[PDB]
């Protein structure tokens, strides 16, 4: 079920970058740079992501077409208004 696996990875990570979650997720926001980017390694270590894959290359594949998040090099951010969310590390 690799297509379903990719969809579950996408939905879980798009949840972390939803406004509903970001409002309260200080740990995640303290890991952003000033552009909102944080390492995909951090996301890949979260328990719900580990429950789907331990292979970070499948995460990149699952997110390739996301309209919520944007991947640059090995980091990911929320696309919309990215500077609203970072917090002092
Ligand atoms: Cl885990």
Residue numbers in the entry: 322 to 410
Show the paper's wording.
Here, we characterize the La-module of LARP1, which plays an important role in regulating synthesis of ribosomal proteins in response to mTOR signaling and mRNA stabilization. We show that unlike other LARPs, the La-module in LARP1 does not contain an RRM domain. The LaM alone is sufficient for binding poly(A) RNA with submicromolar affinity and specificity. Multiple high-resolution crystal structures of the LARP1 LaM domain in complex with poly(A) show that it is highly specific for the RNA 3′-end, and identify LaM residues Q333, Y336 and F348 as the most critical for binding.
Crystallization trials with RNAs between three and eleven nucleotides in length produced seven complex structures, including non-isomorphic structures with the same ligand. The crystals show density only for the 3′-terminal nucleotides and can be classified into two groups based on the stacking of the first and last base. The LaM appears to act as a rigid scaffold and the differences between the structures largely arise from differences in the conformation of the bound RNA. To facilitate comparison of the complexes, the nucleotides are numbered from the 3′-end: A(–1) to A(–4). The position and conformation of the two 3′-adenylates were identical in all the structures while the 5′-nucleotides displayed considerable structural plasticity including two different stacking configurations. Analysis of the nucleic acid backbone angles confirmed the rigidity of 3′-end of poly(A) RNA, which results from tight binding to the LaM domain. The glycosidic angles and sugar puckers for A(–1) and A(–2) were tightly constrained with A(–2) generally showing the smallest spread in structural parameters and lowest B-factors. In contrast, a large range of angles, including syn glycosidic angles and C3′-endo sugar puckers, were observed for A(–3) and A(–4) nucleotides. The structural heterogeneity suggests fewer structural constraints and weaker binding of these nucleotides.
